[PDB]
């Protein structure tokens, strides 16, 4: 009890939509608390990647961080299904997965076993593919050195389109594209702009392969140290900032194509059914690994 300063880490850098929302959240919090709740920000992955920061929340060394609902598959394997390529069709579908009994089951397991209290989840965009050569069809993916994050389902998307996946951390991506150490990367409409991957990538392939949410997670042990009113402020505010964040991404995702082409970017609309070819065996193994079918259930929500 007293003045409280919460520690928030993120991989996103200053000038990102994720950071602007966290700064707005920082902006909202000590305003509504009359200075008693403060939020310190640690962007650009200076504390580690999202997996490392989640581990710090579990151990009580960091208070708040971003994570996708499917990224919980690192801890709760069935949760990765929401991130399987093309299974989640849009954000509204993902939120329905996030709020179903299956979602609440994962969220409960996050809280009991890993000290993660998900306060809300926001839209962070649908991932598209950029490259140094044009990607008109899935057949053009063969032999492409495609950068992916250290995430199984981003790799799977790359593997099954026929590309050569190269997993590496988000901070190294721009330069590896500049040096053509990798031929391409895959990320959302706002991230390619904010991170300025388009400066070093002449092609963009509307592949729509993964829909990213963005959970705001607080350490449960820190949450339980708060007063009921402080919790209400934080709850009110995160939900406050999420509506803006989700809307901001939707606005940007609608306009940024007009922007990229005006920056001489070649944008291709490949036929996606052959990409949907390919995840079919991946879905079947996923259900099999887990001991219980889930992929078909999730896709139908």
């Amino acid at each position, epitope marked *: 009890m007293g003045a409280t300063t919460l520690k928030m880490g993120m991989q996103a850098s200053v000038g990102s939509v994720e950071y602007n929302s966290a700064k707005m959240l920082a902006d909202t919090l000590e305003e509504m608390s009359q200075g008693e709740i403060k939020l310190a920000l640690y962007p650009s992955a200076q504390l580690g990647d999202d997996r490392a920061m989640l581990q710090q929340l579990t151990l009580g060394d960091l208070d708040i961080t971003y994570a996708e609902f499917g990224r919980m598959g690192l801890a709760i394997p069935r949760a990765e299904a929401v991130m399987l390529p093309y299974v989640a069709k849009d954000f509204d579908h993902l939120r329905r997965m996030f709020e179903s009994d299956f979602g609440q089951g994962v969220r409960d397991e996050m809280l009991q076993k890993f000290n993660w209290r998900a306060l809300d989840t926001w839209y962070n965009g649908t991932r598209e593919t950029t490259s140094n050569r044009p990607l008109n069809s899935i057949e053009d993916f063969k032999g492409l050195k495609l950068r992916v994050p250290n995430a199984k389902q981003n790799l799977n998307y790359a593997k099954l389109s026929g590309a050569s996946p190269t997993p590496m951390s988000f901070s190294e991506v721009y330069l590896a594209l500049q040096t053509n150490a990798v031929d391409g990367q895959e990320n959302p409409l706002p991230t390619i702009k904010t991170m300025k991957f388009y400066e070093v990538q002449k092609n963009l392939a509307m592949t729509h392969h993964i829909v990213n949410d963005q959970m705001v997670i607080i350490s449960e*042990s820190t949450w339980q140290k708060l007063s009921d009113t402080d919790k209400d402020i934080i709850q009110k505010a995160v939900q406050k900032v999420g509506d803006a964040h989700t809307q901001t991404v939707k606005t940007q995702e609608a306009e940024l194509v007009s922007f990229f082409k005006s920056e001489g970017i070649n944008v291709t609309y490949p036929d996606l059914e052959p990409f949907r070819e390919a995840m079919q065996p991946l879905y079947k193994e996923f259900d099999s690994n887990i001991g219980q079918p889930i992929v078909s259930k999730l896709a139908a929500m």
Partner: nanobody, 123 residues
Framework: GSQVQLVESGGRLVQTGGSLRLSCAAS????????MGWFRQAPGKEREFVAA????????YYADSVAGRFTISRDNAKNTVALQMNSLKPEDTAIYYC??????????????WGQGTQVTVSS
């Protein structure tokens, strides 16, 4: 197949000041998905955390009782975790347990556990 099976080896009678390497073999689910930990138990007590190592080996955690003396390491090709014990003292006599979990945790016990391996340190 989601569960992990663990088998420790290395337990011996050793001398004060001696060094001993424990090894643990993991099977079942994908080894690199798990933080690997070492715990030890004397009768009556609960278990002491000894050491833990992250998925890639980049992060490792140690108890103050063994920090500087013990070293934990893993091999994701052999699916093994090892605990190198140096400067062993009698307080360290215990059954040492290999454990696996998706994340390092302190508010609860790890999900998966080995049969236990006995370490005896003589004065």
């Amino acid at each position: 197949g989601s569960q992990v099976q663990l088998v420790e080896s290395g337990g011996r009678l050793v001398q004060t000041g001696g060094s001993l390497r424990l090894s643990c073999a993991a099977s079942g689910d994908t080894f690199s998905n798990y933080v690997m930990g070492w715990f030890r138990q004397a009768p009556g007590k609960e278990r002491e955390f000894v050491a833990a190592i992250s998925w890639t080996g980049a992060n490792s955690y140690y108890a103050d009782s063994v920090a500087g003396r013990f070293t934990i390491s893993r091999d994701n090709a052999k699916n093994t975790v090892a605990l190198q014990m140096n400067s062993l003292k009698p307080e360290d006599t215990a059954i040492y347990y290999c454990a696996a979990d998706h994340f390092h945790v302190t508010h609860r016990k790890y999900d998966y556990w080995g049969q236990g391996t006995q370490v005896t340190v003589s004065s």
